Amino acid sequence: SPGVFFDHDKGKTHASGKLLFAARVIPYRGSWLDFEFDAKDIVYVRIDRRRK
DNA sequence: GCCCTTAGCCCCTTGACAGGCGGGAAACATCGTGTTAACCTTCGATTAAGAGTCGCTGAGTCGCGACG
């Protein structure tokens, strides 16, 4: 369904054991947006999972 | 019972078509060109809600020493 999503990572793709909390808003028709974090504790706008 | 004579079958010679592949000659549908010059000189999708790993790159941290 269209709307913002916050998929907290379950440890996978983490530095050691930390979570990611990828805040992604899925539009009904358009380009996806990802506001996930990293091990450096920084929010990166991974638009449509292309770049970070 | 054997030899002569004649009939039937097989074979040869000619032939009057019949039309039949096929190139030619011709009537007709293709296939690659042109050519015209009145106005816009960045078009657009598409992953991206699982998962084990190959191949490369570029930042922050240290040694060895020289010159005051």
XYZ file of all heavy atoms in Angstrom, chain B residues 21-25:
106
model
P 4.727 -31.037 -66.384
O 4.440 -32.487 -66.437
O 4.054 -30.190 -65.374
O 6.309 -30.827 -66.223
C 6.849 -29.510 -66.091
C 8.346 -29.499 -66.366
O 8.572 -29.580 -67.793
C 9.062 -28.228 -65.949
O 10.456 -28.475 -65.826
C 8.769 -27.314 -67.129
C 8.863 -28.287 -68.306
N 7.890 -27.995 -69.383
C 8.334 -27.774 -70.694
O 9.548 -27.822 -70.940
N 7.416 -27.517 -71.659
C 6.117 -27.484 -71.350
N 5.248 -27.212 -72.329
C 5.656 -27.684 -70.019
C 6.564 -27.951 -69.083
P 11.446 -27.304 -65.345
O 12.781 -27.907 -65.138
O 10.782 -26.585 -64.235
O 11.518 -26.309 -66.599
C 12.031 -26.770 -67.846
C 12.329 -25.603 -68.777
O 11.285 -25.497 -69.783
C 12.394 -24.235 -68.104
O 13.357 -23.425 -68.763
C 10.983 -23.701 -68.319
C 10.696 -24.214 -69.721
N 9.275 -24.351 -70.021
C 8.280 -24.731 -69.156
N 7.100 -24.781 -69.708
C 7.327 -24.403 -71.026
C 6.418 -24.273 -72.103
O 5.195 -24.474 -72.104
N 7.057 -23.871 -73.270
C 8.408 -23.628 -73.387
N 8.845 -23.248 -74.599
N 9.271 -23.748 -72.383
C 8.662 -24.149 -71.239
P 14.033 -22.183 -68.002
O 15.280 -22.671 -67.373
O 12.989 -21.544 -67.170
O 14.409 -21.171 -69.183
C 15.300 -21.582 -70.215
C 15.079 -20.774 -71.484
O 13.739 -21.008 -71.985
C 15.186 -19.268 -71.327
O 15.584 -18.690 -72.563
C 13.758 -18.878 -70.961
C 12.947 -19.841 -71.824
N 11.677 -20.245 -71.229
C 11.466 -20.676 -69.943
N 10.224 -20.988 -69.697
C 9.572 -20.757 -70.900
C 8.207 -20.912 -71.240
O 7.280 -21.313 -70.521
N 7.965 -20.572 -72.568
C 8.919 -20.124 -73.454
N 8.501 -19.837 -74.694
N 10.200 -19.968 -73.143
C 10.453 -20.306 -71.856
P 15.864 -17.113 -72.671
O 17.091 -16.931 -73.477
O 15.788 -16.548 -71.305
O 14.614 -16.559 -73.501
C 14.369 -17.029 -74.825
C 13.205 -16.284 -75.453
O 11.952 -16.818 -74.940
C 13.165 -14.791 -75.151
O 12.570 -14.088 -76.237
C 12.283 -14.743 -73.913
C 11.245 -15.796 -74.265
N 10.579 -16.379 -73.104
C 11.162 -16.766 -71.923
N 10.317 -17.258 -71.061
C 9.092 -17.198 -71.714
C 7.805 -17.594 -71.276
O 7.485 -18.094 -70.190
N 6.834 -17.361 -72.248
C 7.075 -16.813 -73.487
N 6.014 -16.661 -74.293
N 8.278 -16.438 -73.909
C 9.235 -16.662 -72.974
P 12.576 -12.481 -76.256
O 13.975 -12.048 -76.469
O 11.838 -12.009 -75.064
O 11.721 -12.102 -77.557
C 10.492 -12.771 -77.830
C 9.325 -12.089 -77.134
O 8.912 -12.875 -76.001
C 9.617 -10.687 -76.596
O 8.918 -9.716 -77.363
C 9.128 -10.711 -75.135
C 8.363 -12.026 -75.030
N 8.514 -12.676 -73.735
C 9.686 -12.935 -73.085
N 9.534 -13.541 -71.935
C 8.164 -13.690 -71.819
C 7.360 -14.263 -70.821
N 7.856 -14.803 -69.705
N 6.022 -14.252 -71.008
C 5.531 -13.705 -72.128
N 6.191 -13.139 -73.142
C 7.516 -13.166 -72.921
